[PDB]
Amino acid sequence: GRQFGHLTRVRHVITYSLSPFEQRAFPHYFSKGIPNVLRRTRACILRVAPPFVAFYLVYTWGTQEFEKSKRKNPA
Template identity: 30%
Template structure:
């Protein structure tokens, strides 16, 4: 049985070497987390959700507004007093 590296008494960080792996990192002050957010985010969201999927929410929104407008006008007409009922009042 081959003895493992852990049995040879090495610490956990020195268990083995990896060849052919390269790691790159930027310092915290060199990163630009918000780069292009304010000038590209609106355009990207508009293209992905509004331009491509407009038929999912524009017709229901228009129909809901028309129903709302009709109901508001019908309610106002139903609650309006008839002036002919009060023509003979003194």
Template identity: 35%
Template sequence: MAGGKWMGWWGHLGAAKQRGIVTYTLSPYEQRAFAGALHQAVFNTFRRVSGQAFYIAVPMGLAYGVFTWGKENHQWRLSKEGHALHGDH
């Protein structure tokens, strides 16, 4: 009670009932929170990865090329021919 007047339950504070307010509800048994989530995840992941592939593939290709060149050059420099051309250690 507030000021000697009962104010009603929460949300019904003694005012006149409002008209024209429509409330919609959906049963929890009808909701599908993860409907299509796996399908969307697969295609969204593919779209995002394919969009970034150029930015990843080119530097990795260059790094692989430099790495293989370095290994071959190192092996060549350890050979007799490499020693003869560049001198001994």
């Protein structure tokens, strides 16, 4: 279902738009663009990054213990 004209009630909202043939597809692409990705990165590192390094560490340690274990000195 769904349709358009039966979704919900909206009042007093104007929407100015401009035709795609009158504007640029990539406005300040590098100018405003890159700052935004850095800002999006800041916003999320502390939530995405840590779990992963914990694995990165568990992975390298895990490998070292295993390979070092199949060796032996006395007895």
